[model samples]
Target: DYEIQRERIELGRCIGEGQFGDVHQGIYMSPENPALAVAIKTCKNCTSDSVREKFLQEALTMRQFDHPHIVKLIGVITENPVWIIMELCTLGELRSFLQVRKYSLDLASLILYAYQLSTALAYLESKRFVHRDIAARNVLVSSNDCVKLGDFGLSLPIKWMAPESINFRRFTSASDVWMFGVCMWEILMHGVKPFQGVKNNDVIGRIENGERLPMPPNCPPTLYSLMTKCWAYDPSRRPRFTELKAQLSTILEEEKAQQE
Candidate 1:
């Protein structure tokens, strides 16, 4: 449903590099005086037809999205090496952004970010889609302080995974909720790595033994309570993204009332 005119895009210099490929800045010639800026994620190794199709699936999935908090899929370049184009988030990945800023965010701002994430996840849940990977690194921040979910390569390790995902490889909206808790921790900790010092192989065991990450230092009690609920061992026990969104709304309202 979403395709781009390859000739219209003027690919620019590399902005970021990852295991998949390089992300570059691009300009879309829209026939207007000013061209639209975009980020081009190139899969240089997608030489095979099957590889291209598989790689493009992420683009297709993103194309169905119309949420404000989710990254927008502008179009694609389906050639020898596939290139997926998206709206550029000049602030870059949220994890690195938070790290550079050192979590100077006020409670209202932090809650707003969490609210936006829950709202995005709620939309995905309604669509019956599961985001296998949800973490600070997978989120992007725009120049306007807008946060967006990105990086659908599905390459996150067990640290940000739920118990069901770790042990049974089962991915669901509930599992995504689990990862959201970890993402919250990341935001509160200013991008500190989760479960630090824990080996990959040991992660599942630790979770199975009921090891949940501790509350972030100085994190609000209600927010930490929501994180605990999200990390519930039983998948059925995890709150739906909708519920999280509502709770966050309440928290925001309560905070505002206190400020008033």
Candidate 2:
């Protein structure tokens, strides 16, 4: 309330809400320009210096990354309270869309979405970064069904690798591949609950204990195998993002070319 008043920003309807904060649909205009649609995120409250550093890191790092599929970070404001202003995704979360609509997506539609997301991952890898958290809730689909990968809150560089261990501050490219499997499950299940019998904490525990994540409902055999491979006990057993993207691209292309 205080931040909104101080910024002189108008708040519209509630567009989306997440663990961090509620995102409002609002117009943001620079001096000498008309207001443009934007999704605004207001931080919860005071966070540790380390937690705060993540947002600060994104501000400095994101500006260097530009791709059609990656959501563009516009700006950040941190005066007592933190805020992230980003490109407005009118359609909202992909999982929400899947839940409300009971429609089958064609092969081309799948390929388009997968390709866009893979390209985003590829671009991030080029920057020596890995999107540690990739999921449908983090992916936005436009009105015309174009896909854009968003929400890099858990993103980090892959250079800080340690033998036989994973660190919160550092991530391996294969860990991102694990996330890609989850994202695919979301798309296939039309956003059904992942690991239905397990809680979030349990999933984390299982990952640390070396248990494979269950396959999504109605998942193809080959895809199911791929998901298991991604969540392999040894991170080294997991495919790299680049290799996964290439294999997926080839399979997608073959599937498309078959009908044509």
Candidate 3:
């Protein structure tokens, strides 16, 4: 149901180096749509049994999901040198997008970006899926207001992780929430990396001492407080994605009014 013909794809430039292979921006001449911009993940060594299985599994993980704010899987090619196709976000990674527009982007727009992610994350939460990596760089800007969560896999982003995740390998939706809070911080900071210049090993100790990121210069007190709630040391105390989405809508409306 998910396979695509290799002939229909015209591979272009390499946009990224994913964990398994190089991701290239390409054109997919679909039977129904004519032509579409796409991101093609080319398997580096799909010829081998182990690498092929692991590589295919990544495509499988994304297949079951269908959410607007999450990048969608177009199709896959199972032949040797397999390719996994996905929607291309013309604006690309959100962190750099925000950073480049730092001088012109508005506060209300940033809140809207935050709200979009919460909705997508909430959808995943309802499906009982844990988005191990939740951060600005992982988010893609599909449009001016639409930011998508991309890349699904097992846990790892040490700096953005919660205490339990770092020490116990426990990655739940709540752990994702903690990382989201850092991502929200990234949005406000115009894409500055959290725990700037700090080594991965030192991050655990900093979290142990309860040192959270300072609020960005123009971030509202209300929004910063919401960010703090996501960082609650106890996973049970952390707000759910549903709750986060609701709160974000409230803040978003308030910020929108300010824009007027």
Q: Which number leads on lDDT?
A: 3
Lowest summed lDDT across 10 adjacent residues in model 3 is found at: 149-158
For model 3, how does the per-residue alpha-carbon lDDT over 1-260 read when each residue is reduced to its tens digit? 98999999999999888877898999989678657999998888889889888887877998889999999999999997889989999888899999899989999889889999999999999999998888998899998979998877532478898999889989898999999999999999998898889888888888888888999989989899999999998999999998899999999999878767
- On residues 79-102, what C-alpha lDDT tens digit does candidate 1 reach at each position? 756789899888888888878877
Q: List the residue pairs that clash in candidate 2.
A: none
Candidate 1 vs candidate 3: which has greater TM-score?
3
Question: How many steric overlaps does candidate 2 have?
Answer: 0
- Please provide, for model 2 over 1-260, each residue's C-alpha lDDT reduced to its tens digit, 9 standing for 90 to 100: 11223264556888877556677877776567767677777656437655566655655665677998887777766664666667787888888877776365664465557667878888787777866677777788775458898766553211112213244544567767767777776676777756666665555566667566456555545556766766675677877667666867776776678677
Q: Is candidate 2 or candidate 3 better by lDDT?
A: 3
Question: Each prediction's Cα RMSD?
Answer: 1.9, 5.6, 1.4
> How high is each candidate's TM-score?
0.92, 0.74, 0.95
The list of candidate 1 runs beyond 4 A from truth reads 256-260
lDDT of each: 0.84, 0.66, 0.89
